[PDB]
Design a protein around this ligand. Structure first.
Ligand SMILES: COc1ccccc1CN[C@H]1CCCN[C@H]1c1ccccc1
Length: 469
């Protein structure tokens, strides 16, 4: 009632309206007016910016004036729209955000499967609006004006079941539809995406040949000399010794296959890891049987492992199961040429020009690939390693870009959950008007935040905001 409190709240609500409409209109201009930005995700973001700007301009003002002044001035039609639009707007924006999380989950988890096209995005947006308006419809249908003694009032006359069941059913249905369900769906999608991205995911500032000394030839000769071997084509395995997973058993079977051939004299093997005692005794058994095989079961520093990746000719990764194949990125960044099973992330990282791929679990195919690598070592291998280094670096810039965007969207959804929790708890409480003023300001402030999040956490949006201003 104090006029300053009223001027305070008038200034705050006007700040919400101007920041939300300016920022969201700027976002729609940024995505639509610039050709490169017309992606599927950005179309859904335009829908959310359209809904948030619309609800700000058409509802924040009247919610403030009618809340403080306790008098309806805008007629029956706008009483219905005032109680109707905000549900549909929240539905359109939050389910546009669900479309964004779903699109990233598709692009990351099943890249080969087709995402829907731009015009298909427009159809999905129209379906989003249909479901939004039809969910919001019952409330706008039951709003009405009561002309009365001192004032006109805008009230929702829910059907007169004495237990107030129909009203409570509608409110729980809306809250589930536009808060809990979308937050759970988006939470599963971005949790899957975030775990697989963080685990993907190599420190390129460390796994880098620049910290190695000398030519690769000098390093290979010094390394083999330290193991008691003389120069040869050098293969390395590093990983846990186990059965049915990291494939050291397939490599040992392949080593026994090569051991009877004359080409085996020209090969060197360095098997590194710890695990099954039988695989350890088998690898050690191969180590005493052949002078070109060396086994290291003790733990090594990562600086020494980087020394190995930069000295050996090839790294063998015969995994049965390899979700991420980070060891291949470590070898390729250091110029070792991978010979790996076509499983999991290894199939995604390695290409025809950047490694040698084989069927998982087939030792003869692996030995044949090792013989092919020996024949390839005859010719210069520098461009092959260059293609491997370029591939490992470019794959990491990808994963970094995806982690940056997905972190931004997580901030968007988090802002949504924070802004809407007090509101939904307030209206579902019945089943303190200063508290209503605060909760209403916080709930309707969410419309101004998305343009700020895009400007701060996304370089493309930052360039577009500096272009407009
Ligand atoms: C900003 O305003 C809104 C924002 C989101 C949803 C709904 C509204 C308006 N609806 C409120 C207002 C009074 C009538 N019902 C209420 C209600 C409360 C909770 C679920 C569903 C409805």
């Amino acid at each position: 009632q104090p006029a300053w409190q009223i001027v305070l709240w008038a200034a705050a609500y006007t700040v919400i309206v101007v920041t939300s409409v300016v920022g969201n209109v700027v976002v729609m201009w940024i995505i639509l007016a610039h050709k490169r930005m017309r992606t599927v995700t950005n179309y859904f973001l335009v829908n959310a910016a359209f809904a948030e700007a619309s609800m700000a301009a058409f509802n924040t003002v009247v919610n403030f004036t009618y809340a403080v002044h306790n008098e309806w001035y805008y007629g029956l039609f706008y009483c219905k729209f005032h109680n109707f639009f905000p549900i549909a707007a929240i539905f359109a924006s939050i389910y546009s955000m669900t479309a964004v999380a779903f699109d990233r989950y598709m692009a990351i988890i099943h890249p080969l499967q087709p995402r829907l096209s731009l015009t298909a995005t427009k159809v999905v947006i129209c379906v989003i609006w249909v479901l939004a308006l039809l969910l919001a419809f019952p409330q706008g249908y039951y709003s009405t004006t009561e002309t009365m003694p001192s004032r006109v009032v805008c009230k929702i006359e829910w059907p007169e079941h004495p237990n107030k069941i129909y009203e409570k059913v509608y409110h729980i249905c809306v809250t589930v539809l536009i808060y809990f369900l979308p937050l759970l769906v988006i939470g599963y999608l971005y949790t899957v995406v975030g775990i697989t991205l963080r685990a993907s995911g190599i420190d390129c500032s460390f796994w880098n040949e620049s910290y190695l000394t000398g030519s690769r030839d000098e390093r290979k000769k010094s390394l083999l000399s330290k193991f008691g071997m003389d120069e040869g084509v050098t293969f390395m395995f590093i990983g846990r010794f186990d059965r049915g997973q990291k494939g050291v058993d397939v490599l040992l079977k392949a080593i026994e296959i090569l051991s009877s051939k004359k080409e085996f004299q020209e090969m060197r093997f360095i098997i590194i890891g710890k695990g099954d005692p039988e695989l350890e005794g088998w690898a050690r058994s191969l180590e005493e049987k052949h002078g070109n095989v060396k086994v290291i079961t003790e733990m090594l520093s990562r600086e020494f492992v980087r020394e190995l990746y930069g000295s050996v000719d090839f790294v063998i990764i015969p995994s049965y199961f390899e979700p991420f194949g980070l060891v291949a990125l470590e070898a390729m960044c250091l110029g070792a040429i991978p010979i790996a099973s076509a499983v999991g992330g290894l199939r995604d990282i390695i290409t025809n020009e950047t490694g040698i791929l084989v069927k998982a679990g087939d030792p003869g195919e692996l030995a044949n690939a090792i013989l092919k690598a020996l024949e390839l070592s005859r010719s210069d291998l520098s461009k092959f390693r260059e293609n491997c280094k370029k591939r490992a670096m470019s794959f990491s810039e990808q994963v970094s870009a995806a982690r940056k965007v997905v972190k931004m969207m997580i901030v968007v959804v988090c802002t949504f959950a924070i802004c809407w929790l007090p509101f939904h708890i307030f209206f579902l409480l019945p089943y303190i008007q200063q508290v209503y003023l605060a909760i209403m300001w916080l709930a309707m402030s969410s419309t101004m935040y998305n343009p700020i999040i895009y400007c701060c956490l996304n370089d493309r949006f930052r360039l577009g905001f500096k272009h407009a201003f």
